[PDB]
Amino acid sequence: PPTYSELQITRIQDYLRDIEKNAERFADLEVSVAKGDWQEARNIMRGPLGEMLMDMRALNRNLLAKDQPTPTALTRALTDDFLKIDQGADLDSVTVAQEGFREAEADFKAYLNSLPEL
C-alpha cells in the first residue's frame, strides 16, 4: 500500500513553503482590485501568485495518486478564478473582480485543506 517517500515529503514541504509565502500577496491583490488598479493587480497575479500556481502544480505532481484529484481540481479552479479577476479588470468593474477574488480565496483555502497527511 503506497506511502510517501522522503523525497516526496521534502519536495512537498519546500513547495508548500513557497506557496504560503507567495500567498501573502493575496492581500495586495485585494487592495489593488478595490482601487481598480488593474496594472498592479495583473502584476501580482502574473508574478508572485503565478509562481504560487506553478508551485501548486509541482506539489500536486509529488502527491500519491490517490491524493491527487482534489488538490489538482482546486488548482484548476484557482487558475480560472484569476481569469475571472482579469475579466473584471477588462470590464473595469471592481464589483465583478472582487467576486473573482472571493472565489480565488475560497478555492485556495480549500486547496490547503485538501493536502494529505504525510
Author numbering: 34 to 151
Quoted passage from the original study:
Here, we show that CyanoQ (encoded by tll2057) is indeed expressed in the thermophilic cyanobacterium Thermosynechococcus elongatus and provide evidence in support of its assignment as a lipoprotein. Using an immunochemical approach, we show that CyanoQ co-purifies with PSII and is actually present in highly pure PSII samples used to generate PSII crystals. We have also determined the crystal structure of CyanoQ from T. elongatus to a resolution of 1.6 Å.
The predicted product contains residues 25–152 of CyanoQ plus 5 additional residues (GSELE) at the N-terminus. Topologically the protein belongs to four-helix bundle superfamily and its fold is classified as mainly alpha up-down bundle (CATH 1.20.120.290) with four α-helices, of which the first two are broken, and one 310 helix. The first amino-acid residue of helix 2a, Trp71, is absolutely conserved in the analysed CyanoQ sequences. The indole nitrogen is exposed towards the solvent, and in this structure a 2.8 Å hydrogen bond is created between Trp71Nε1 and Asp125Oδ1. The other absolutely conserved residues are found right after the C-terminus of helix 2a and consist of a Gly80Pro81 motif that is immediately preceded by a positively charged amino acid, either arginine as in T. elongatus or in most cases histidine. Both glycine and proline are well known as the most efficient ‘helix breakers’ and in fact they separate helix 2a from helix 2b in CyanoQ. Despite the fact that five out of the six corresponding positions are occupied by potential metal ligands in T. elongatus CyanoQ, no zinc cations are present in the crystal structure. Although there were no bound Zn2+ ions in our structure, we were able to fit a sulphate ion into the electron density.
